[PDB]
Design a protein around this ligand. Structure first.
Ligand SMILES: [Ca+2]
Length: 223
């Protein structure tokens, strides 16, 4: 997260870190057994780390649970990032309390102008590289479809939306991938892609979770 703030420990209780020997992506806990992330975060041997603040220090609220199975969206295209969503099942159910909690799925899509909270452990610099240990947060609005398409001609599908600031300076970034965009207590987006980070006229692009609720529910019901 570039141009954000320190969230505060366990203030974003649905935020998870995906670990394969190291943090590599965010994700969102959606029930005791299941995490939503980006398909571009797929790999084998994922451990899901819940209850994290400092990802390099055991601070007392962590739950580390290996994934039993990952399901990339059936229509994910890694070239275009269309359908950049993946479900991860935990081998055991997480213990839920106020520091580790699921986030609700949307019942309706969000509109441009809605304010959201984006979070993660990704790079905090727009030029060069600095990875934080503690969770970072950014409040940002959803942008109009027209501004999003104008920013990224030929690239924005109906399964994507832009959020952030066209002036630059405030965005998600590498290592935030897969993490949440939450608006009015609903998971509306997944950190997906963008050109660089926090660049002028190049906002963040996010998977439009409301399009996937049917798929998520039916997949959980049968897996
Ligand atoms: Ca920790």
């Amino acid at each position: 997260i570039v141009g954000g703030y320190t969230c505060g420990a366990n203030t974003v209780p649905y935020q998870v870190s995906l670990n394969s020997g190291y943090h590599f992506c965010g994700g969102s806990l959606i029930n005791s057994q299941w995490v939503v992330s980006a398909a571009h975060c797929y790999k084998s041997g994922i451990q899901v780390r819940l209850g994290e603040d400092n990802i390099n220090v055991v601070e007392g609220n962590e739950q580390f649970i290996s994934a039993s199975k990952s399901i990339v969206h059936p229509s994910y295209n890694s070239n275009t990032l269309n359908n950049d969503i993946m479900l991860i099942k935990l081998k055991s159910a997480a213990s839920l309390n106020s520091r580790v909690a699921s986030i609700s799925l949307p019942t309706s899509c969000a509109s441009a102008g809605t304010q959201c909270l984006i979070s993660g452990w990704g790079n905090t610099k727009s030029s060069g590289t600095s990875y934080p240990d503690v969770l970072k947060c950014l409040k940002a609005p959803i942008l109009s479809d027209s501004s999003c398409k104008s920013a990224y001609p030929g690239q924005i599908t109906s399964n994507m939306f832009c959020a952030g600031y066209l002036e630059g300076g405030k965005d998600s970034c590498q290592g935030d991938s897969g993490g949440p965009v939450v608006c009015s207590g609903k998971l509306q987006g997944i950190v997906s892609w963008g050109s660089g980070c926090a660049q002028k006229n190049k906002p963040g692009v996010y998977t439009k979770v409301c399009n996937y609720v049917s798929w998520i529910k039916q997949t959980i019901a049968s897996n």
